[PDB]
Write an enzyme that holds these catalytic residues in place. Structure first.
Site, short mmCIF file in Angstrom:
data_model
loop_
_atom_site.label_atom_id
_atom_site.label_comp_id
_atom_site.label_asym_id
_atom_site.label_seq_id
_atom_site.Cartn_x
_atom_site.Cartn_y
_atom_site.Cartn_z
N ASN A 114 -20.86 48.86 73.44
CA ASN A 114 -22.21 48.70 74.95
C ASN A 114 -22.45 47.67 75.29
O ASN A 114 -22.09 46.10 75.16
CB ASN A 114 -23.91 48.42 73.14
CG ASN A 114 -23.82 47.37 72.63
OD1 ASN A 114 -24.88 46.56 73.38
ND2 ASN A 114 -23.34 46.60 71.80
N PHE A 118 -30.44 44.03 76.38
CA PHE A 118 -32.45 44.44 76.18
C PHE A 118 -33.26 45.90 76.55
O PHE A 118 -33.51 44.50 77.15
CB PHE A 118 -31.92 42.84 76.03
CG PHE A 118 -31.73 42.05 75.34
CD1 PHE A 118 -31.15 41.75 73.91
CD2 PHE A 118 -31.41 40.37 76.08
CE1 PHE A 118 -30.66 41.38 73.27
CE2 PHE A 118 -30.74 39.07 75.09
CZ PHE A 118 -30.74 39.60 73.84
N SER A 184 -26.04 37.86 72.05
CA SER A 184 -25.89 39.08 73.44
C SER A 184 -24.58 38.48 74.35
O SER A 184 -24.91 37.83 74.87
CB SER A 184 -27.23 39.47 73.59
OG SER A 184 -26.49 41.05 74.45
N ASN A 186 -24.25 40.21 77.36
CA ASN A 186 -24.72 41.03 77.88
C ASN A 186 -25.67 41.08 78.79
O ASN A 186 -26.69 41.54 79.31
CB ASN A 186 -24.82 43.05 77.63
CG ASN A 186 -24.30 43.29 76.17
OD1 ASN A 186 -22.95 43.74 76.77
ND2 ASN A 186 -23.98 44.21 75.68
N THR A 187 -26.38 40.09 78.44
CA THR A 187 -27.24 39.38 79.39
C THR A 187 -26.74 38.09 79.71
O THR A 187 -26.03 37.17 79.17
CB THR A 187 -28.62 38.68 78.41
OG1 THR A 187 -29.12 39.93 78.46
CG2 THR A 187 -29.57 37.87 79.29
N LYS A 224 -28.74 33.87 64.99
CA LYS A 224 -27.33 34.41 65.29
C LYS A 224 -26.33 34.63 66.05
O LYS A 224 -26.26 34.25 67.78
CB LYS A 224 -27.34 36.58 65.82
CG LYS A 224 -26.26 37.20 65.69
CD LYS A 224 -27.39 38.53 65.37
CE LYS A 224 -27.05 39.93 65.70
NZ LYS A 224 -27.14 40.52 65.84
N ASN A 253 -22.77 38.78 65.93
CA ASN A 253 -22.91 39.79 67.68
C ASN A 253 -21.38 40.45 67.52
O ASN A 253 -20.16 40.25 66.70
CB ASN A 253 -23.77 39.33 68.31
CG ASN A 253 -24.62 39.98 69.26
OD1 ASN A 253 -24.23 40.71 69.31
ND2 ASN A 253 -25.77 39.70 68.85
C1 LIG Z 1 -25.71 49.90 70.18
C2 LIG Z 1 -25.33 48.20 70.00
C3 LIG Z 1 -26.89 47.37 70.24
C4 LIG Z 1 -26.81 46.47 69.59
N1 LIG Z 1 -28.59 45.50 69.72
C5 LIG Z 1 -28.48 44.90 69.39
C6 LIG Z 1 -29.70 44.28 69.39
O1 LIG Z 1 -30.52 44.02 70.50
N2 LIG Z 1 -29.56 42.63 69.23
C7 LIG Z 1 -28.54 41.77 68.32
O2 LIG Z 1 -29.34 40.67 68.08
N3 LIG Z 1 -27.86 42.51 67.88
C8 LIG Z 1 -27.03 43.84 68.71
N4 LIG Z 1 -26.25 44.25 67.91
C9 LIG Z 1 -25.39 43.73 67.46
C10 LIG Z 1 -25.17 44.70 66.42
O3 LIG Z 1 -27.06 44.03 65.72
C11 LIG Z 1 -24.01 43.90 64.98
O4 LIG Z 1 -24.60 42.51 65.02
C12 LIG Z 1 -23.18 43.88 65.72
O5 LIG Z 1 -23.50 45.59 65.81
C13 LIG Z 1 -21.86 44.33 64.74
O6 LIG Z 1 -22.09 44.83 63.39
P1 LIG Z 1 -21.39 46.74 62.90
O7 LIG Z 1 -20.15 46.30 63.63
O8 LIG Z 1 -21.94 46.63 62.08
O9 LIG Z 1 -22.42 47.46 64.13
C14 LIG Z 1 -26.15 45.86 68.89
C15 LIG Z 1 -24.82 46.75 68.27
C16 LIG Z 1 -25.10 48.05 68.61
C17 LIG Z 1 -24.03 48.51 68.90
O1 LIG Z 2 -29.21 44.38 73.78
C1 LIG Z 2 -27.54 44.58 74.18
O2 LIG Z 2 -27.05 44.74 75.32
C2 LIG Z 2 -26.99 43.81 72.61
C3 LIG Z 2 -28.23 42.95 72.98
C4 LIG Z 2 -26.82 41.98 71.52
O3 LIG Z 2 -27.04 41.23 71.54
N1 LIG Z 2 -25.75 42.43 71.46
C5 LIG Z 2 -24.91 44.19 71.84
O4 LIG Z 2 -24.20 44.24 71.16
N2 LIG Z 2 -25.97 44.42 72.42
#
Ligand SMILES: Cc1cc2nc3c(=O)[nH]c(=O)nc-3n(C[C@H](O)[C@H](O)[C@H](O)COP(=O)(O)O)c2cc1C
Ligand SMILES: O=C(O)c1cc(=O)[nH]c(=O)[nH]1
Ligand SMILES: COC(=O)/C(C#N)=C1\SCC(=O)N1c1ccc(OC)cc1F
EC number: 1.3.5.2
Length: 365
Positions: A114, A118, A184, A186-187, A224, A253
């Site tokens: 992804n 944000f 993140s 992605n910023t 985080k 993350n």
């Molecule tokens: C589509 C998507 C959006 C995410 N958005 C955020 C976010 O806004 N803030 C954040 O701290 N982590 C974000 N994450 C990271 C997840 O919270 C998590 O740390 C990461 O996906 C690893 O867990 P998983 O393998 O169970 O998905 C995102 C992950 C995915 C896949």
């Molecule tokens: O918004 C996102 O792009 C995002 C934020 C984040 O903390 N982690 C991530 O995988 N995506």
């Protein structure tokens, strides 16, 4: 169960066949918010309860940030069987995030990439949303079902620490814990906030702001972190967390790495990788951070959890709680009960009286 198979073999692959991942996620958020979810038959046993961060947690399995970015599905997520919910990331001002497509499935890897950037309704919108169910949340929290709020920074912000501080002021009073998301991928520039000097400046401001909130509205503050840190960066973060009394860490993350072996056609898309390929990289980061903090700093372990074994590995490495996201995307809601059932079974097999006994167990071997 029958539900576990039907979801994993029929429903979710059908949805995946019909809808691009962003569409599918939007639909999932809508269904969840409406409670259109399978019966969560598993009843949390006492062996799954954890006390940490100033709260009771009925079970240690949470929904990770990003699934409910804007706090639209909190109650649905508890219905799913999560012991705790984390919303966000929320930015101070509303912002759209990156152009689409910005999320990609790697089914052959049980992974996602992804680059949302944000996308956020912003603090005001989320504030009002949470305020509408604030006392319902207070009752949930007291019953062992806490709420976390994860804070981000806007793309065009000229003072990152001020963005975080604004979040603490606005959403702090509505959260059991806050998360300073400085990982993140992605910023632009955001992950440089993990550097020692930047983090200490940023976290000192965040903690000052949190300590200014009235007692009953004062959350725990967690940081985080990424799975891609150097050893120096890990060391530095551990040092600052001890220096300042940060309450906990969320590890990890998504990864900017692309482990050897990925098969999905979309492996070379820009963004953060989640799911199975991140699993052990995140477990190892938990292990290192537990040791660097002498087991005195609670860790929420996240990345690639899709089974009880995966959860227990992170617990044993030092996590007090775990979260998942990408497993839900592939297996659907029944995965939550699956993880819990399997975790309870393994705890009994391994001679633990409960979750609490297993936290950091590998470091005492
Ligand atoms: C589509 C998507 C959006 C995410 N958005 C955020 C976010 O806004 N803030 C954040 O701290 N982590 C974000 N994450 C990271 C997840 O919270 C998590 O740390 C990461 O996906 C690893 O867990 P998983 O393998 O169970 O998905 C995102 C992950 C995915 C896949
Ligand atoms: O918004 C996102 O792009 C995002 C934020 C984040 O903390 N982690 C991530 O995988 N995506
Ligand atoms: C047409 O879409 C559905 O039928 C879905 C969905 N989405 C349903 S039917 C019952 C159910 O639990 N979900 C669902 C809810 C949340 C999800 O989180 C990923 C996934 C789901 F499949």
């Amino acid at each position: 169960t029958g539900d576990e198979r039907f979801y994993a073999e029929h429903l979710m692959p059908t949805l995946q066949g019909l809808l691009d991942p962003e569409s599918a996620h939007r639909l999932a958020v809508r269904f969840t918010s409406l409670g259109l979810l399978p019966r969560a038959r598993f009843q949390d046993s006492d062996m799954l309860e954890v006390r940490v961060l100033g709260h009771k947690f009925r079970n240690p399995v949470g929904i990770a940030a990003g699934f409910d970015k804007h706090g639209e599905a909190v109650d649905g997520l508890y219905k799913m069987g999560f012991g705790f919910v984390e919303i966000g990331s929320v930015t101070p001002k509303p912002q759209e995030g990156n152009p689409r497509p910005r999320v990609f499935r790697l089914p052959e890897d049980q992974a996602v990439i992804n680059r949302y950037g944000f996308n956020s309704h912003g603090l005001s919108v989320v504030e009002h949303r949470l305020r509408a169910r604030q006392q319902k949340q207070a009752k949930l929290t007291e019953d062992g079902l806490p709420l976390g709020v994860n804070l981000g920074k806007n793309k065009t912000s000229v003072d990152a620490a001020e963005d975080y501080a604004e979040g603490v002021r606005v959403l702090g009073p509505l959260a059991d814990y806050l998360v300073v998301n400085v990982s993140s991928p992605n910023t632009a520039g955001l992950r440089s906030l993990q550097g020692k000097a930047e983090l200490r400046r940023l976290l000192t401001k965040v903690l000052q702001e949190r300590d200014g909130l009235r007692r009953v509205h004062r959350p725990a503050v967690l940081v985080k972190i990424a799975p891609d840190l150097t050893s120096q960066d890990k060391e530095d973060i551990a040092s600052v967390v001890k220096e300042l009394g940060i309450d906990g860490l969320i590890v990890t993350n998504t990864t900017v790495s692309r482990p050897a072996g990925l098969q999905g056609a979309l492996r070379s898309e820009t963004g953060g990788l989640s799911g199975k390929p991140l699993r052990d990289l995140s477990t190892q980061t938990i292990r290192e951070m537990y040791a660097l903090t002498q087991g005195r700093v609670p860790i929420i372990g996240v990345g690639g959890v899709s089974s009880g074994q995966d959860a227990l590995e992170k617990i044993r490495a030092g996590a007090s709680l775990v979260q998942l996201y990408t497993a839900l995307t592939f297996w659907g809601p029944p995965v939550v009960g699956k993880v819990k059932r399997e975790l309870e079974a393994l705890l009994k097999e391994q001679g633990f009286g409960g979750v609490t006994d297993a936290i950091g167990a590998d470091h005492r071997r």
